[PDB]
């Protein structure tokens, strides 16, 4: 609902060409909701971290001095404080700034063992894994040189343990489960604060600004749509994105008598639309609960996780399901 949405939509297309004339297409790689990806040295040099299986990989393409410009990226990436409204991971700039407290600080150690704070520990470590972890690889015409990192097993609780107080204050305010919302916000982005999607969901939760964010908003009585800022502050965020869980829970998918049989419906909702979850049963929106409201919870479980139209949507039942059956018992 912009011409921000369209000066977004170019900025893209220029961001991935950019990309695409240096790497080749096979090689064009970018920021994710699971995913962060950030390119600095004019392109020749990304900065990965997969935040679905715990890795971080930082590659160079670049000719000259590749040991060099890997060495760059490795240090500042251990060490950046996560402001994700200030980051632009849709630039080549280099806006990674060091924090007293990294993002990554305790989700991943050096070699030692020790979990990276200082500049130091990070140097050493840097040149550690260049000397004994550095990679090579041909993309058909060129050399990319690289370094992975692995993350500590529990990275994803880690990670989580920064989010659970504002889980919980959303929580209480709501009327949802704090299992619902780690399970939802697990799905979406691992946890993930600088979490972009090319659905325009933006943050932890995957609020996208111009639907649920605006629905969000006037439900409350506020006037517009939250910014970009806004929805990746992680308490902005939960905050918009639980709201939009109650939403679907009350008005849109409230006909549903059985609570268990809603929790289905509002999860599998909450990817793909309550207008689509409704529709599997009938185009009538009342019927459709009606027919919900007589059957047992585990065969509306089976009916969305096998007859929703989205592939995605199905998945994504299952897996938000799956995570919430290890949120929910305490």
Do not use: C
Not at 173 to 192: H, P, R
Not at 211 to 218: L, M, N, Q, Y
Not at 268 to 295: E, H, P
């Amino acid at each position: 609902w912009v011409k921000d949405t369209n000066g977004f939509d170019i900025l893209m297309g220029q961001f991935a060409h950019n990309i695409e004339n240096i790497w080749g297409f096979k090689e064009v790689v970018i920021a994710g909701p699971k995913d962060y990806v950030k390119y600095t040295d004019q392109y020749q040099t990304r900065s990965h971290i997969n935040f679905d299986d715990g890795t971080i990989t930082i590659e160079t393409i670049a000719g000259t001095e590749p040991a060099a410009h890997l060495r760059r990226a490795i240090i500042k990436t251990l060490l950046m404080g996560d402001d994700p409204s200030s980051v632009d991971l849709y630039s080549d700039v280099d806006d990674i700034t060091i924090s007293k407290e990294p993002f990554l600080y305790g989700q991943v150690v050096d070699n030692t063992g020790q979990p990276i704070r200082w500049e130091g520990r990070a140097s050493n470590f840097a040149d550690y894994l260049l000397k004994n972890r550095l990679k090579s690889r041909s993309n058909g015409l060129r050399i990319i040189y690289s370094v992975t990192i692995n993350m500590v097993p529990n990275h994803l609780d880690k990670r989580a343990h920064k989010y659970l107080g504002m889980v919980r204050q959303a929580s209480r305010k709501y009327g949802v489960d704090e299992s619902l919302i780690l399970a939802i916000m697990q799905t979406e982005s691992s946890f993930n604060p600088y979490a972009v999607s090319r659905s325009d969901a933006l943050g932890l939760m995957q609020v996208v600004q111009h639907t649920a964010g605006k629905d969000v908003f006037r439900s409350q009585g506020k006037s517009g749509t939250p910014s970009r800022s806004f929805l990746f502050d992680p308490a902005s965020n939960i905050d918009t994105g639980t709201a939009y869980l109650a939403m679907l829970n009350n008005v849109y998918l409230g006909g549903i008598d059985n609570p268990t049989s809603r929790r289905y419906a509002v999860i599998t909702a909450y990817n793909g639309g309550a207008g689509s979850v409704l529709r599997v049963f009938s185009n009538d929106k009342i019927q459709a609960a009606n027919i919900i409201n007589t059957m047992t919870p585990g065969d509306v479980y089976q009916t969305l996780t096998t007859r929703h139209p989205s592939a995605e949507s199905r998945r994504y039942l299952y897996k938000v399901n799956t995570a919430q059956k290890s949120y929910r018992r305490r």
